[PDB]
Amino acid sequence: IISPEIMPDNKVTFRVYSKDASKVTITGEWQTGPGGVEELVKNDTGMFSITVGPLKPELYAYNFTVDGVKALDANNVQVRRDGTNYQNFFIIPGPESDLYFHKNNVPHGTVTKVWYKSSVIGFDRRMYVYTPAGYEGDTQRYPVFYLLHGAGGDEDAWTNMGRTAQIMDNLIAQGKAKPMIVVMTNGNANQAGAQNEVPPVTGKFEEHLVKDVVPFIEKNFRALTGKDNRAIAGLSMGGGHTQTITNDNPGMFSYIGVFSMGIEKIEKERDAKIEALKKSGYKLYWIACGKDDFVYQSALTLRNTLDKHNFKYVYRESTGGHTWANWRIYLSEFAPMLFK
Amino acid sequence: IISPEIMPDNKVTFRVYSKDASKVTITGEWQTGPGGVEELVKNDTGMFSITVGPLKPELYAYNFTVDGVKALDANNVQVRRDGTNYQNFFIIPGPESDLYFHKNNVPHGTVTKVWYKSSVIGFDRRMYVYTPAGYEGDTQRYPVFYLLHGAGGDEDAWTNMGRTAQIMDNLIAQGKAKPMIVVMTNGNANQAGAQNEVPPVTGKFEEHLVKDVVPFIEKNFRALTGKDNRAIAGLSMGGGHTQTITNDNPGMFSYIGVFSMGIIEKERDAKIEALKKSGYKLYWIACGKDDFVYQSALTLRNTLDKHNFKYVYRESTGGHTWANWRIYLSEFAPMLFK
């Protein structure tokens, strides 16, 4: 049985076989709000099927519901994990999705799942580190890009949900982004690592990124250093982390990205940190947000605050909302801007 | 909804909610066999449930079947992958399973997913490399253990299905095995990497392990070199790979493990004679009594006996299972480089 079967016109057919099931539906990311879940059709020999689309090029996650129970597609080996939420996925080929594929003619960088001591948090933690193709067997040193996830995620999320390794492999091989080290931390100070592999064990995360993570990377990888060789970005909660880290350490990062995130003694303190950051010598402050994201007005408030300080930034407004589809797009556009 | 719920007497309760489903069963590794599939019982509120056991300490994989369709347990975050087969799992604590847990008071080694060029196979390929805790930030060098999977597997299997990183973390921290680098290759020469992340692209794997993998490891990791610092082991197909590699390259590995695998005619005898004189330190054959390959492994032992070739034989309960392969790894690694 072939499922999903992607046709040349970018329609997709899904199939589930059961003579004993009475109802099979599909939940998928192509489905709009009003529409919702779609029902498969049962043929007389027990095969359920539905054909959707045509779909625009993109990565789409989906799963089934069989007689009220969630079920994955047993004939699709592609499975992602979002915290505790497992789903299948597939990628419609095309211009908009081309960076998300693993290509066989493309040199591939290493993904390292490494543990490090944290003086701030008080126990060892795990992070993922991506190094560019050819890092092994060479003397060259590389700039570093710290990439932060949002609430409910972990250090596995940007590679698993966000296709960071494929995007970076493809951008670098194509000459569109400089070879770089990408450091993906666990942003939940109470965790040691991702909940699917690590059972359980206020500024702690942010402080420990600067005091624990950055020194560890610079000691144990061939990293260029200084703000001009250092980038940081994050989505939602991690976009808040990004602001806090950079506001509290002006002059430490020259490339700053805030994805899908926005904003009297203390009100002066924030103005003062903006002014110190304004004069730090950064090269790029990049704010990206979906028009329909619930945080839209808060990001507009941030943009207006920066305007009032004559703080130079770049704003990328996109369609859609608070989704990994947009965060893949933001990574795809931000990385080619770095270290140039 | 809690599922699975491990009880103090090592019984386990599973739960699934659906008012629509007519029949929900569970398939699990504690079961007698296909006829021993168990059916959950529906209550008036739509919750299906079953309590099983007491179960012996072990890692157990399972899944549900809902009116004929395989379904995972959406309330259990632990999921493994055997090629294309995804299943949930849980671990019953106790003596026989203690090494399989991720423990918070234990230093943890790095797992690296690294690509290398292959002159023999002709395209770049992916392997997993485990380095011991504290490898980073130190200049110490370590011996190397090459660990091979079987048919249907890939470079992700021994860590995913075999809990290698946990077993190695725990064995090393407990002082039972020496700190070592563990290299897990993809043994399918037609593949570049694991099929869940890598699309499709003669003795080629065996040749490329010696000519491509070993130089890459010794150049790009802080590896001790030489036969006394080199171990190799594999299960089923990979246990055949292990025999071919060591028979063809006597004096390259001093620790050899053949898990759940057995055995023109004159070349084999001469290679055994060559290997016998190679100064190896351990030739360890492990196989389950109920394994289909049991007789073939006996033939292998008999052929080594014919040459007065010294080996150590570990006969276990059970058969051709990852439970036994985790056990074999747990017992083989403490024997290495001592």
Side-chain angles (χ1 to χ4, degrees):
Chain A
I1 300 158
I2 305 171
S3 189
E5 185 181 347
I6 303 165
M7 313 306 302
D9 66 351
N10 290 344
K11 290 183 181 170
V12 189
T13 295
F14 303 89
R15 301 184 175 89
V16 175
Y17 170 74
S18 173
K19 277 154 171 61
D20 296 331
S22 72
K23 169 146 215 230
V24 181
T25 73
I26 184 163
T27 301
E29 292 184 323
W30 61 90
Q31 290 163 353
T32 60
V37 178
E38 301 168 286
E39 294 188 20
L40 277 67
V41 166
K42 195 184 191 172
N43 81 1
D44 280 336
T45 45
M47 186 74 66
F48 289 78
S49 72
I50 186 180
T51 296
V52 313
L55 302 182
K56 298 156 159 45
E58 251 287 6
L59 183 155
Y60 298 93
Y62 73 99
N63 59 266
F64 300 121
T65 307
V66 178
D67 293 335
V69 179
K70 175 179 169 170
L72 300 181
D73 188 338
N75 293 292
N76 181 3
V77 75
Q78 292 191 122
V79 170
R80 72 176 196 186
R81 182 191 57 90
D82 183 12
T84 65
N85 179 14
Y86 291 89
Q87 290 185 287
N88 298 99
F89 67 93
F90 62 88
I91 316 178
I92 299 289
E96 292 92 345
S97 64
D98 201 50
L99 299 171
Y100 307 159
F101 286 91
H102 183 93
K103 297 158 138 64
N104 283 140
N105 80 295
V106 169
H108 300 304
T110 293
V111 176
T112 304
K113 307 186 194 185
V114 52
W115 290 80
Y116 60 101
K117 300 196 172 67
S118 176
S119 69
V120 173
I121 291 176
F123 49 79
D124 297 2
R125 315 188 72 245
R126 194 181 70 166
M127 57 179 172
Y128 285 26
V129 180
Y130 166 95
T131 51
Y135 179 95
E136 293 84 357
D138 214 340
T139 49
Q140 182 173 334
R141 307 185 74 80
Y142 301 95
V144 184
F145 174 23
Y146 298 84
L147 181 60
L148 281 49
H149 67 80
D154 51 70
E155 70 278 8
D156 177 74
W158 263 108
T159 53
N160 191 327
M161 299 289 291
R163 308 292 287 176
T164 289
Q166 296 86 10
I167 289 166
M168 291 310 304
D169 279 0
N170 290 322
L171 290 176
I172 291 170
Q174 289 175 32
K176 278 164 207 180
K178 286 196 145 136
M180 63 180 82
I181 301 166
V182 184
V183 176
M184 289 156 292
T185 45
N186 181 308
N188 319 298
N190 63 316
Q191 307 176 1
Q195 58 183 308
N196 68 313
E197 275 163 25
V198 180
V201 315
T202 39
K204 267 182 151 159
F205 170 74
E206 299 91 319
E207 178 182 0
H208 114 298
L209 186 137
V210 166
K211 296 195 188 166
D212 299 333
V213 173
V214 166
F216 181 96
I217 294 292
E218 291 181 0
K219 170 178 200 305
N220 290 303
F221 297 83
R222 300 202 313 272
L224 298 170
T225 67
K227 64 166 175 303
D228 283 357
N229 300 309
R230 207 177 285 117
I232 186 172
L235 70 95
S236 197
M237 180 188 70
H241 291 159
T242 294
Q243 294 177 65
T244 295
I245 292 162
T246 53
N247 290 346
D248 291 2
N249 298 269
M252 187 169 178
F253 300 83
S254 283
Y255 301 85
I256 305 173
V258 180
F259 305 168
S260 308
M261 185 60 185
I263 277 306
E264 181 100 27
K265 206 186 333 193
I266 260 134
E267 168 81 351
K268 306 184 123 50
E269 280 173 36
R270 194 237 299 292
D271 286 351
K273 278 171 174 176
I274 287 169
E275 290 295 314
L277 189 60
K278 179 186 183 203
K279 302 156 197 170
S280 66
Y282 72 97
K283 308 301 189 283
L284 176 62
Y285 202 102
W286 198 67
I287 298 162
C289 192
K291 177 59 160 248
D292 301 329
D293 198 313
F294 50 89
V295 79
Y296 175 85
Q297 277 289 325
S298 181
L300 171 60
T301 300
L302 170 64
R303 291 191 278 125
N304 289 341
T305 299
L306 297 180
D307 290 344
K308 189 174 255 283
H309 285 262
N310 297 297
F311 184 105
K312 304 317 181 201
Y313 60 89
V314 173
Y315 176 47
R316 161 74 158 104
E317 186 164 296
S318 74
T319 60
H322 204 81
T323 65
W324 272 103
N326 272 338
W327 301 325
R328 288 191 295 269
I329 289 164
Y330 300 166
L331 170 61
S332 292
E333 298 180 358
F334 185 65
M337 303 174 180
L338 300 185
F339 315 125
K340 292 178 184 180
Chain B
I1 300 170
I2 294 183
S3 183
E5 177 170 12
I6 305 170
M7 310 303 299
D9 63 354
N10 287 350
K11 291 189 180 168
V12 188
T13 299
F14 306 86
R15 303 180 173 92
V16 189
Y17 173 89
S18 163
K19 292 214 188 161
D20 297 293
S22 295
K23 178 169 178 186
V24 174
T25 65
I26 182 165
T27 294
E29 291 181 327
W30 60 91
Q31 282 167 353
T32 63
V37 54
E38 303 168 301
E39 179 169 5
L40 283 63
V41 172
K42 185 176 204 158
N43 78 356
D44 257 354
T45 83
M47 192 67 60
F48 289 77
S49 71
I50 187 180
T51 298
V52 309
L55 303 173
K56 310 188 293 305
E58 251 290 1
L59 183 159
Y60 297 98
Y62 71 100
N63 60 264
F64 301 119
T65 306
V66 182
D67 296 332
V69 178
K70 173 173 158 158
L72 295 182
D73 185 340
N75 295 113
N76 179 4
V77 73
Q78 292 185 307
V79 174
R80 73 180 195 181
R81 180 186 61 89
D82 185 8
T84 62
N85 180 11
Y86 291 89
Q87 288 184 289
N88 296 104
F89 68 95
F90 60 94
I91 311 181
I92 299 290
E96 296 86 356
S97 69
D98 197 53
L99 292 175
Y100 306 157
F101 289 89
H102 181 96
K103 299 170 184 302
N104 276 325
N105 54 13
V106 170
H108 299 302
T110 294
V111 179
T112 302
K113 309 200 194 186
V114 56
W115 292 80
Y116 58 102
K117 302 181 172 154
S118 179
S119 65
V120 174
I121 289 172
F123 52 80
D124 301 0
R125 310 185 76 245
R126 201 182 63 160
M127 60 186 164
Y128 283 31
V129 181
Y130 166 96
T131 49
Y135 177 93
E136 291 84 350
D138 185 307
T139 56
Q140 185 162 341
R141 296 168 63 228
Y142 301 96
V144 184
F145 174 21
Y146 297 84
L147 185 56
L148 279 48
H149 66 75
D154 53 64
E155 70 281 7
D156 177 73
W158 264 108
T159 55
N160 193 326
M161 299 288 294
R163 308 289 288 174
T164 294
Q166 294 85 10
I167 292 168
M168 292 312 299
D169 279 357
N170 290 324
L171 283 178
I172 291 167
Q174 295 174 24
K176 289 153 161 201
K178 298 187 151 192
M180 64 180 74
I181 297 159
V182 179
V183 180
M184 293 150 287
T185 50
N186 183 310
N188 315 296
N190 60 313
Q191 299 174 11
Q195 63 182 301
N196 64 316
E197 276 164 16
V198 180
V201 181
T202 325
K204 280 199 178 68
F205 167 75
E206 299 91 322
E207 177 180 0
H208 116 287
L209 189 141
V210 171
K211 304 184 172 182
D212 300 329
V213 173
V214 166
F216 182 93
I217 290 297
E218 296 184 350
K219 172 222 231 262
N220 290 296
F221 295 82
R222 308 202 309 270
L224 301 174
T225 75
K227 60 189 185 197
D228 283 359
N229 294 309
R230 222 180 266 121
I232 183 163
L235 71 95
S236 196
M237 179 189 70
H241 291 158
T242 293
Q243 296 174 67
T244 299
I245 288 162
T246 53
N247 286 350
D248 289 358
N249 299 270
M252 182 166 186
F253 306 83
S254 293
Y255 300 84
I256 308 175
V258 184
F259 307 167
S260 312
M261 190 56 179
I263 237 174
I264 295 158
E265 319 92 333
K266 293 186 194 256
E267 309 160 49
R268 223 207 265 108
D269 278 328
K271 275 163 178 171
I272 295 179
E273 286 296 308
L275 191 57
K276 169 190 186 182
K277 305 158 195 182
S278 72
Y280 73 100
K281 305 290 182 284
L282 172 63
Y283 200 99
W284 197 68
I285 301 164
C287 187
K289 143 182 61 216
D290 297 326
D291 196 316
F292 188 89
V293 83
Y294 179 88
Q295 280 301 314
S296 201
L298 172 53
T299 298
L300 170 64
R301 287 186 278 132
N302 284 341
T303 299
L304 300 175
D305 287 348
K306 170 168 98 169
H307 295 269
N308 313 123
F309 184 107
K310 262 49 138 160
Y311 59 83
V312 171
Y313 175 53
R314 162 78 160 100
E315 183 173 298
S316 70
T317 60
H320 207 77
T321 67
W322 272 104
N324 275 332
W325 299 326
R326 288 189 301 266
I327 290 165
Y328 300 165
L329 169 59
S330 296
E331 299 183 358
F332 188 63
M335 297 169 188
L336 303 183
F337 324 121
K338 307 193 167 168

